[PDB]
Design an enzyme around this catalytic site. Structure first.
Site, PDB file in Angstrom:
ATOM      1  N   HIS A  52       0.806  -1.218   0.000  1.00 45.81           N
ATOM      2  CA  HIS A  52       0.000   0.000   0.000  1.00 45.81           C
ATOM      3  C   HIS A  52       0.843   1.273   0.000  1.00 45.81           C
ATOM      4  CE1 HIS A  52      -2.060   3.314   2.224  1.00 45.81           C
ATOM      5  NE2 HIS A  52      -2.968   3.080   1.294  1.00 45.81           N
ATOM      6  N   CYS A  53       0.497   2.216  -0.871  1.00 34.71           N
ATOM      7  CA  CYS A  53       1.059   3.560  -0.783  1.00 34.71           C
ATOM      8  C   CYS A  53      -0.012   4.635  -0.987  1.00 34.71           C
ATOM      9  CB  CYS A  53       2.226   3.752  -1.756  1.00 34.71           C
ATOM     10  SG  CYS A  53       1.788   3.875  -3.506  1.00 34.71           S
ATOM     11  N   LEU A  54       0.354   5.888  -0.714  1.00 33.35           N
ATOM     12  CA  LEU A  54      -0.578   7.019  -0.759  1.00 33.35           C
ATOM     13  C   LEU A  54      -1.449   7.050  -2.015  1.00 33.35           C
ATOM     14  CD1 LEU A  54       1.162  10.234   0.676  1.00 33.35           C
ATOM     15  CD2 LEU A  54      -1.182   9.471   1.115  1.00 33.35           C
TER      16      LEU A  54
END
Ligand SMILES: [Ca+2]
Ligand SMILES: [Cl-]
Ligand SMILES: [Cl-]
Length: 335
Positions: free
Chosen positions: A96-98
């Protein structure tokens, strides 16, 4: 390309064991129904899941928002993911990233290389793009995947420990960032990892303005660095705010990253054409053949290292890419 959407969230199974999740309680809902007790979330965002209570399943990697992570961290996360996959055949990794969605993508690409699915960056990036269309890797991210391939090659590259003196930076021709689109008012930052170590930025009124006829921007730096280097340039702008104060903002002109240990020892110039720069604004703000060069010199003595990099205590020789898949058939299909 197998994608799912609970609502706002997007779950893409790059493989059956490597999931990319895009931009809370629903996160948990989906993953518990599909992978109860067998997932770890590798949160690459700087902002965490403290108050989630499903946080017990989250590894807070805290990577930089826009720039490629340091090679040390890129490698360390891959190894953690590998160990997690090894621990139980039902285990899956959730990345997961922004929505600075290059972070997810470089991790996945690096993982292909780490697990010996590929040995060169091109094929990895191609598989990645085919699995995660629409998200491009900046040149720095690709450069770093190149570094991962070097480290993990059949005959592995050993990064040297010589510090690099960056004597100056030269940018030419002059780019178009002011209101009239005929020049700029530039300053440069140099960072190691995410730590800023030098800036040429000063009071707005002290900052030299450049126009077409100045020809180039030449900024002596005189800084000696080792490891993961970021060099960035911005245009400084002043606007009258409410209260009539000068609101000073900056607009990024470019950014570039490299690791000194991968620079050949006799290098005196590092050159980056426009295609090799990150974080550029719209193409109309740049002159033709825009380029950035750094005048540099590697020093003669090794730097004394506080921490040793994880690749020094790791050999991927034995790693089987089957680890990424849940069956031979899935594996063979992917190739
Ligand atoms: Ca390898
Ligand atoms: Cl301006
Ligand atoms: Cl200006």
């Amino acid at each position: 390309v197998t994608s799912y959407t609970k609502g706002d969230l997007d779950f893409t199974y790059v493989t059956s064991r490597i999931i990319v999740m895009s931009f809370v309680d629903d996160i948990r809902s989906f993953l518990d129904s599909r992978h109860l007790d067998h997932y770890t979330v590798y949160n690459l965002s700087p902002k965490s899941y403290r108050t989630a209570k499903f946080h017990s399943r989250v590894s807070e990697c805290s990577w930089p928002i826009r720039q490629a992570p340091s090679l040390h961290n890129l490698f360390a996360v891959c190894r953690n993911m590998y160990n997690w996959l090894l621990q139980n055949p039902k285990n899956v990794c959730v990345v997961h990233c922004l929505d600075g969605r290059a972070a997810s993508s470089i991790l996945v690409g690096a993982m292909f290389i780490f697990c010996n699915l590929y040995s060169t960056p091109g094929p990895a990036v191609r598989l990645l793009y085919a699995k995660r269309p629409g998200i491009g890797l900046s040149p720095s991210h690709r450069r770093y995947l190149g570094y991962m391939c070097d480290l993990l090659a059949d005959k592995p590259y050993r990064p040297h420990f010589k510090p690099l003196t960056i004597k100056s930076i030269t940018v030419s021709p002059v780019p178009f960032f002011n209101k009239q689109r005929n020049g700029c008012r530039p300053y440069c930052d140099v960072l190691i990892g995410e730590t800023k170590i030098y800036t040429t930025c000063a009071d707005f009124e002290r900052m030299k303005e450049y126009r077409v006829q100045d020809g180039k921007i030449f900024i002596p730096l005189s800084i000696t660095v080792q490891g993961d280097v970021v060099v960035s340039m911005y245009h400084l702008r002043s606007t009258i705010g409410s209260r009539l104060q000068a609101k000073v903002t900056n607009t990024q002109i470019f950014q570039l990253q490299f690791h000194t240990g991968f620079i050949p020892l006799d290098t005196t110039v590092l050159k980056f054409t426009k295609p090799e720069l990150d974080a550029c604004d719209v193409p109309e703000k740049y002159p033709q053949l825009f380029q950035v060069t750094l005048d540099v010199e590697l020093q003669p003595h090794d730097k004394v290292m506080e921490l040793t990099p994880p690749w020094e205590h790791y050999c991927t020789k034995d790693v089987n890419p089957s680890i990424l898949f849940s069956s031979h058939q899935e594996h063979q299909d992917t190739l």
